Design a protein around this ligand. Sequence first.
Ligand SMILES: CC(=O)N1CC(Nc2cc(C(=O)NC[C@@H](O)[C@@H]3Cc4ccc(OCc5ocnc5C)cc4CN3)nc(N3CCC(C)CC3)n2)C1
Ligand SMILES: CC(=O)N1CC(Nc2cc(C(=O)NC[C@@H](O)[C@@H]3Cc4ccc(OCc5ocnc5C)cc4CN3)nc(N3CCC(C)CC3)n2)C1
Ligand SMILES: CSC[C@H]1O[C@@H](n2cnc3c(N)ncnc32)[C@H](O)[C@@H]1O
Ligand SMILES: CSC[C@H]1O[C@@H](n2cnc3c(N)ncnc32)[C@H](O)[C@@H]1O
Lengths: 624, 624, 302, 298
Amino acid sequence: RVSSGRDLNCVPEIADTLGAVAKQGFDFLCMPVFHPRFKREFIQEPAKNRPGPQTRSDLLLSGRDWNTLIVGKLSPWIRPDSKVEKIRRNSEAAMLQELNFGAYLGLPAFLLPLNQEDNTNLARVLTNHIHTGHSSMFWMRVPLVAPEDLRDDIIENAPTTHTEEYSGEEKTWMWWHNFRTLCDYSKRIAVALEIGADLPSNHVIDRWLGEPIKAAILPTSIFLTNKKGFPVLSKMHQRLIFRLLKLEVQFIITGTNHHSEKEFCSYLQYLEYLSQNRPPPNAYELFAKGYEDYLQSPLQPLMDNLESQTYEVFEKDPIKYSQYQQAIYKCLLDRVPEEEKDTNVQVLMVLGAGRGPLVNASLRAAKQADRRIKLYAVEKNPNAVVTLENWQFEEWGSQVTVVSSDMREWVAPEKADIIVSELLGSFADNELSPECLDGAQHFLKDDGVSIPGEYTSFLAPISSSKLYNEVRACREKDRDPEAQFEMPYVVRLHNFHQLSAPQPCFTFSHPNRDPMIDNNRYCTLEFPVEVNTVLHGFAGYFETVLYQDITLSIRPETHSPGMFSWFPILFPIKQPITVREGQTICVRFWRCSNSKKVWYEWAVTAPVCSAIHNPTGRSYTIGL
Amino acid sequence: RVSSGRDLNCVPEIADTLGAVAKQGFDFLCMPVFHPRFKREFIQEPAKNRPGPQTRSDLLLSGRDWNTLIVGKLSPWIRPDSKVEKIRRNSEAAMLQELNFGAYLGLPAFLLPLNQEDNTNLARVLTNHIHTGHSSMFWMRVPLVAPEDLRDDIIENAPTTHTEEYSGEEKTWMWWHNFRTLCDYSKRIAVALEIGADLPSNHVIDRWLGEPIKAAILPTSIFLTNKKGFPVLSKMHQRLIFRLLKLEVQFIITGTNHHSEKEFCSYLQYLEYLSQNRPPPNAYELFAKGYEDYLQSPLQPLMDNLESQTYEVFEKDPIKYSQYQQAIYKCLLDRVPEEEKDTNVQVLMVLGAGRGPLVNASLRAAKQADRRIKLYAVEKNPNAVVTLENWQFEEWGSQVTVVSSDMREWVAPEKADIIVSELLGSFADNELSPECLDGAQHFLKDDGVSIPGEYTSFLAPISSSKLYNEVRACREKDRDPEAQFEMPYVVRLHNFHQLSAPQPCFTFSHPNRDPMIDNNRYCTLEFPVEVNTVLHGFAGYFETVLYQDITLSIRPETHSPGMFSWFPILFPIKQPITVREGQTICVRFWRCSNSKKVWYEWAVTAPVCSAIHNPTGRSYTIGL
Amino acid sequence: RVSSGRDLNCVPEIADTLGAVAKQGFDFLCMPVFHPRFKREFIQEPAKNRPGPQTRSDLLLSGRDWNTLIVGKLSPWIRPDSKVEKIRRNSEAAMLQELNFGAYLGLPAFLLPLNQEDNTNLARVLTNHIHTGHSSMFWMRVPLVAPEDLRDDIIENAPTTHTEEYSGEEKTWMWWHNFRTLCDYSKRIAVALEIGADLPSNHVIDRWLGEPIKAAILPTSIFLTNKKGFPVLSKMHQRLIFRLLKLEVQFIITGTNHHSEKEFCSYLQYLEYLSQNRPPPNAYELFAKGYEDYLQSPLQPL
Amino acid sequence: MERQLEAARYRSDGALLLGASSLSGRCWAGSLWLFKDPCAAPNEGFCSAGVQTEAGVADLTWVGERGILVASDSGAVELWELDENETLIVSKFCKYEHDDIVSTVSVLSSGTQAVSGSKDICIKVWDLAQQVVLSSYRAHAAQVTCVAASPHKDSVFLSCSEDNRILLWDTRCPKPASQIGGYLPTSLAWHPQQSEVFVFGDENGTVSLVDTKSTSCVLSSAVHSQCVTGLVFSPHSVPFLASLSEDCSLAVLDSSLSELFRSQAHRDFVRDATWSPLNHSLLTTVGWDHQVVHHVVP
Ligand SMILES: CC(=O)N1CC(Nc2cc(C(=O)NC[C@@H](O)[C@@H]3Cc4ccc(OCc5ocnc5C)cc4CN3)nc(N3CCC(C)CC3)n2)C1
Ligand SMILES: CC(=O)N1CC(Nc2cc(C(=O)NC[C@@H](O)[C@@H]3Cc4ccc(OCc5ocnc5C)cc4CN3)nc(N3CCC(C)CC3)n2)C1
Ligand SMILES: CSC[C@H]1O[C@@H](n2cnc3c(N)ncnc32)[C@H](O)[C@@H]1O
Ligand SMILES: CSC[C@H]1O[C@@H](n2cnc3c(N)ncnc32)[C@H](O)[C@@H]1O
C-alpha cells in the first residue's frame, strides 16, 4: 500500500546498507553518489588533479537495482547560486558531473534542494542537463516551512517574528514556483515536500494543492512517543498524511533513530498502520481510481456513434436509472387519475434510447405506478438499434416501437404525453441536448412533460499546475500549437484546488415555449478568491431536474451519491494567472452556434485578461 | 506457440459455435456479422424498409470476447467495384454498414477480400472509414494464386495456359500493391494470405517478402492424408509454413472437415507439431527476438556518453573479445622474439576503454602469449573512467594506466607498439573510428600496429513495405516532415527481402600513412536485380580485420557466429522505387564532413533517380 | 508629408462630400456605411421586415475609391456590451452586418470605439469576423482622457475629483490593453488615439509609447485662435504632434468648423505647417528611416 | 588507513593524533591513529595504536590525554579511549543524536563536556561522563560549519553557519545565543591569551579579527585564494595564527594579519594543523593528498 524509502547521508558500503533498508522494509534508498564531504576542484591546480577514483563503481549494484532502488542526491556543498564567483563556477561543473553520473547509472529519480529564494543558476544548469542526452525525474526538496521560520527563538538580539505575514508564511511555495517557471514546467521536475515538527497555517499547506508532489519527507524528529514507547504523530500530522495518501506520494524517512529501544521499521509501521486506517473510500471513489486526472477529449454523440462497450459501462449506473424510474413513476401518477387507470394509456417516447435502459426504466415505472403506457424508442445509432430490435422481438413485444431515426427528423404517428431523454453531458448542454429536444418537441402534446425538465451547468475556478501541464503536453502535429488549451476535457479532477464556490452558468428548460428560441448564451461570473494561488482553468459540473424534486447532480456539494456516469469537465486557459488573496476572478462564457455546429468560447477579464479561447470554434466545435 | 483461428461462413448460434472452436483448440474465430446470404437494399422501395432486426445482438457475447475472439468478415455479396451502378451504390452503403458494426462491437480485426484487379472504389470506402471515428485492423484476403490460374483444365474451348508469364504469375501481389497504395499505406491494413493446393514458383512467393502478413489462410482441402489417416502437408507446403513461423503470423483454418474419421483439432495439431519441429534457432537468433524490425536511431558515442547498462550488455559478447584476444595474442608473438621474452615489454594502448573489456582481453592475451606489456586505458567518458579506476586500484595495479581523455587530445608519455580500439559501428565508420584513430596515430611507433587494422562497409538493396512504413511513422513535430527518411537506423532486419548481393562501400585502414589524409568518400554501386520488386532502402553491414586473419563480420554471408554486438543499419529512401526483373539498381553514397561533424548522403540513379538524401547533413550528422 | 483624413458623421451624398474633402486637401474620408441614426431590428417583428434598401449602393464609388479613400465607421447605436440582453443580441447582429459590408466594399480600415471599460462581447464579435473570410485594418477609437474625466465641473451634487489617481488617469490605456489582449494581439487591430482640449500628465501619454497608433484624432474644438484669426494649437499640443510625426500616424480631423471666417483647409494647413517645422533630423536619423522597427536576425560572421 | 587525512592533534607529551576517512572507493569509512613518532606518520605499521571506525571522521578532538571525541558522518558523536597501555583504542560510547553528518566538535574548558555542530543545523551540548546530550539548540537556519569552545569558560563558545551568522553563546542566559556582525563564515579560533578576542575565516579566503565587546571587525586580510578551512594559534605567549585553505596552502600570520610563512607543499586540500608542545616552532599539517608535513616556522 505505502511505497516508502529511506533517506541516508552516510553509506559505508552500498550492499550492506541496501540490504539493511530492504530488511527494514523500505522499497528504495535515497543516498549520495559521491561522498557528501568530498569537495572537488575543477579549475584550480593542484587540487583539480586529485587522482581518481572520484567515487564508487557502478559494478557494485545490478543495473536492475540502480534503476529501481537508488535515488541519487546532490552533494550538499554544491552551491550554483553562491555569491562567490569561484564557488559558483565550481558548483556548476560539480552539479553537471553528479547529474550525468546519475544518468549514467540510470537512476529513476535524483534529489536537489531548494534552500533559498534564488536558485536561478541552479535551474539553468538543470534545464541544460534536461535538454542533453531520458525519463529520469528530478525531486526538488522543498521545506513546507523554511528553516529560518522554524528556528528556536534563542538569539537574544534577533527575536523570531510574532506577527503573521500571510504571504511571508508561503515563501517556500514561491521558491518552488519560480524554480519550475524558470525551468519551463518540465514534466521531469517534481516536489519532495519536507515536513517539520511544527506545521504552518492551513493556507500554507493548501498552497501545495495541485502541485506535482511525488514524495513527502518525514524526519524521525517529528514523531511523538506513545506510552508503549512506539513512535507516532500528532493528529494534525495525521490529517496531512491522509491528504498525501490521496496523492499516492512516496514517503521518505530521514534522520537517525531517536526511538532506539524500538526499531526503524517501527516508524514505517506507523505509516503502514495509518494507510489501512485511512477512512473507507466512498461510492464515487473506487470509481475513477485509475481515471484520476486522466484527460479525455469529449466526442460528439450526435456526429459519431457510441461503441457497444461504452453503452455497456453506463447502463450499469444504479442511481441514474433509479432516479429516472422515480421521475417517470411520479409523472404517471400526476397525469392519470386512479379512476382513469385503465381508460388512459400514456404515450411515452424515449429520445436517444441506446440499448434501452430508459425503456426498461419506463416499463419498471409503469408497473410500479399501476398505469398503462405506449413506448416509442427513438435511436439514431443504427448499431444500437440492432440491440433494441433483438430486445423488442425477444422480450418487450409491440408495446415498444423501435424507431431508427434522429429525433429532429422523425415524423411521429401520434404526439407524446412524455418525452424522456438522457442527452446531458458533464456540462449539461455540451452534448447538444437543447438542439435535439428542440427539434423533437413538436410531437409533444401541448401539455406534455419532458424528462428531464431543466438542467443548469456550473463553473468553478481551479488551480492545478499538474493538469495545466498535462493539457500543455497535448500538442499535436498539423494543428495550432495551442489548440489543446482551447477545448474542454472530461476528467476526474483529483490533484487540484477549487478557488471559489461553483456558480450557475447556463440553464435550459424543456419544453421551451419561447416563440423565438435561441440556445446561444453569454454569462459573466465573479468568483471571490480568499487565497493566494495560480489560476489554470475552470471545472464544469451540472445539475438537472428530471421531474419535480427528482434530481441528478455532479456538483460536488450536491453530488448524487454513487453516480459515476459523468466525470467533471475542465476548461483550461493558455497562460496561468496569479491571484492574490482578496481578488475576484471574473470569467466570461459564451455558448455559440451556427446551423452546422455548436461551441463554447471563454475569457478571464479580472484580475487580468486572457485571450478569448476557442474563437469561431477554431480549435473545437460540436457537430449538429 | 501457434496462435490460430477457425474461419467459418455458417454460425447457427455464436455461443454454441464459439465454444466448439474454443473446445477444438482455436484462439479465435472468423465469422460474418450479418448473415452471408442476407442481401440488404438501401435505395429501392419496398425492400429497403425490410423490418429489422438486420442482424444478431451485441449482447450475445461479452465485450471481452468481441475484442479478443471475433474477427469479422465482409459479406460476400458486397461488390463496391461492380460494373452495375446500382450494385456499386448499394454495396458502398452495405460495406460502410458492416464496417461500422465491426467498429461498434470493437472487433480486433476485420476481413475484406481481394478477388480481382480493380478494388478502387472498395479502397475509397475503406479509406473513408479509416478516417472516421481506432486501432482496429483490416485483413485483406489475397490468394497467393488467383482462382482463374488454378482452375481445372476442363473447359474444352478455354484451355488453361501452359506458357509461363513471369509477371502474370505475380498478379495477386499487384492486386494487393495497388490496393495498399490507393489506401496510402495505412498501418491498419495488412494481408491474410490464402494458400492453395498447388504452390506457384518461388519468385511468386518471395514476392510477399517484406509485406505485412498478419495471417495465413489454410483450406482443409490442401492437406494430404498419411497412412494412419491423419491430415498432413507436402514438404513444399511445410517450407512455406516454416517461413511463415518466422513472421509469427496467425494461421487460419477454413473449409469443412474432409478427414471425418479424424477430428478438426487434428489439422491444428499438425501445425502445433510443425511449430516445435521448427529447426532450432541459431546463436544470433534468440538474440533480437524482441528487436525484430525495431528501429533505433544511432547516437553519437563521441558527443554523448554511454550509460552503464549499455556497456554492461555489450561486454558480454563471447566472440568479439575472443577474436580481440587472439588478434593481440598473435601480434605479440610477431613482435617479440622468444629470446627477447623478458627483455621486451610492449606498450599497448586501449583507445576507448569503456569499462575495460579490451583491457582484460589484452591481459589475457599477454598471459597466453607469455610476453610482457604495459597498458594505458584511454577513455573520454568520465563516468566509465570511475569504473576503470575502481578496477585499476582493486585489481589491475599500476600495470594499467587509466587515462581520462579524448584520444585525439591526449599527450602520451611514450609511443605505443599497439593501439587497440573498439570504435566500429554497424556500418564500420559511422561512429567515426577513422577520425579518432587519425588524431591518435601520432603516438603510435613508426612501426606500430593498430587493432583493428582495416574495416570495410557493405550495402545491399532491400524491399520491405513494412520497414518503409515504420520509418514513415517516425514524423516528429518541429522538424522537416521527411527527416525520418534522411537518416540511418540500427535495426534487426527481419521481415524484408535482399534484392542483390552485398557489395563493399567504404574502406579504412590504420595506421594511415597518407600525407594528405581524407576520410571523405564517394562510391557508385551497381546492383543486378533478378526479381520484380519495390526498393525501400539499403541494408548496411561491415567486416573488419583485427589482425592478419582474425576478423569480425556482420555481413550475413560471412557473419561471425553468435556475435550480437552489432545489428545491421538501414538507409531508407523517401519514395519507393519499382524494379523489374533484369534491371540494375544504381546507388550513390557519400561520406561527407566539415571540422565539426560527419554525415552520409545518398541517392539512387538507376533505374530512376531519387533525391539526394541528407544534403549538407540537414536531417542528420555525427558530432566530432 | 502629412497624410490626413476628414471625419464626418453626416454625408448627404458621397460624391458631393468626397469631392469637397478632396478639394479641401484631405487624403481620405471617415464616414458611416449605414446612416448613423438608422437603427435596425433583427429579431422582433414587425420592425425586422423593414423593406430595404438597408443603405447606400456600392456602385456610388469606384472600387479604387472604396479601397483607398473610405474609412468605415461603426454606427453609434451599436452596443454589444449593453446591460440589456435584447440590445446586446441586436447589436451583435448589427456589428457583424456593418463589418461584413465594410469587407464587401473592400475598405482599407474601419473604426470602432472604446468608450468604456468592458468591451468583452464587442471583442468576441470582432475576433470572429477577423477569423472569417483579409488585410483590412480595425482602428479602435480610444480617448487619451475618458469623457467622464474631462467633463465640466457643473454638476453641483457630483463634483469632479481633485485628487490625483496615478493609475486612474491611465484607465483608457487599460480599455485598449484588455481589448487587444482579448483579441489575441491581432495585427489587424490598431489605435486611433483621440485628443482633447486638456492634455493629461506626461505619464498618461507615455503610456501609449510602443502601442500600434495608426491614427490620431484631432477635434476642431481643441484649436486656439491666433490674432490673424487662424486656428492653432497650444505648445503642449504641438509637442504631442511632433511625437506623433515620428510615428508617421495619419491625422484625422473631426468636428464642425468653428473658425467659419477661415476655411477647413486652414486646420489642415496648420498640420502641414508643423510638419516641415519639425526639428531637422539628426545624422543617425536619415539613416534607418526605412529600417525603423525592422527585425533582422544576426548572422554569424565567423 | 585511508587517504583523506582530516585531523591532526598533538597532546601534552607530543604524541600525534590522526583522524582519517575514505571519501572515495568501495568503502566510505574512517580510522583513528596514534603516532608516538611524528615522523613515522602517516605510515600505518609504524604507529603506537590504531582502530577502524564504521564511518568517516569529519572532526575529532582530544579529551584530556587518553580520550578521543569523534564527529562521525553517521550523525553519531563517539568517545574512544586509549587503553591497554595506549595500544588499543576502544569505543566508550556512540550516540546517534544528530539527524545528519556531524561537522564539528569542541571540548569545553572543564573537559567533562563538549559541543557538536551538524549539517542537521543543530548544536548540542554533551556530558561526556554521563554520555547524554544536555541541550539541543536549533539557533541557525543552515548547516553548522564550526563550533569553538571558550578556552577558560564552560558556558561560552562560538558557532558559525551557512546562514551567515556568527553566534556568541552563553548557556547562562535564557536566550543563550547572541548574533555578532560578509561572505559565509567557515572557521573559528578563540584567542588563547585574550578572551573576548577571536578570529574567523570566510569562504572567500579572508581572515578576520574580532573583539566580542565591539562586534566591529578590527582587521581583515585576503590571505587565501579559497575557503578558509581552519585557524590555529601557536603555543607562544605571543601566538602565531596558522591558516588553512582549499587553495592547498598554509599561511602563518602575526598579531597583525600580515604573512610570515607560506607552504605549497600539499598538492590537495589542507585539512588540519597542530603546533608541537615540545617545539613551539614545529608545525604539522595534514591534507587529502595523504601527506603529513612538518613545518619549521621563523
Ligand atoms: C464504471 C465506473 O465506475 N466508471 C468510472 C468511470 N466514469 C466515466 C465517466 C465518463 C464521462 O464523464 N463521460 C461523459 C458523460 O457525458 C457520459 C457519456 C455517456 C455515453 C453513453 C451512455 O450510455 C447510456 C446508455 O447505455 C445504453 N443505452 C444508453 C442510452 C451514457 C453516458 C453517461 N455520460 N467517462 C468515462 N470514461 C470514458 C468512457 C469509457 C467507456 C469509460 C471511461 N468514465 C467509469
Ligand atoms: C544481448 C543481446 O543478445 N542482444 C541482441 C541485441 N543487440 C543489439 C545491438 C545493437 C547495436 O547494433 N548497437 C550499435 C553498435 O554499434 C553497438 C554499440 C556499442 C556500444 C557500447 C559498447 O560497449 C563495449 C564496452 O563495454 C564495456 N566497455 C566497452 C568498451 C559496445 C557496442 C557494440 N556495438 N543495439 C542493441 N540495442 C541498443 C542498446 C541496448 C543496450 C540493447 C539493445 N542491441 C542485444
Ligand atoms: C446514451 S447517450 C445519448 C443517446 O441518444 C442517442 N442520440 C443522440 N442524439 C440523438 C438524436 N438527435 N436523435 C436520436 N438519438 C440521438 C445517442 O446515439 C445515444 O445512444
Ligand atoms: C565501447 S564503444 C567505444 C568506447 O570508446 C570511447 N571513445 C569514443 N571515442 C573516443 C575518443 N575520441 N577518445 C576516447 N574514448 C573514446 C567511448 O566513450 C566508448 O566507451
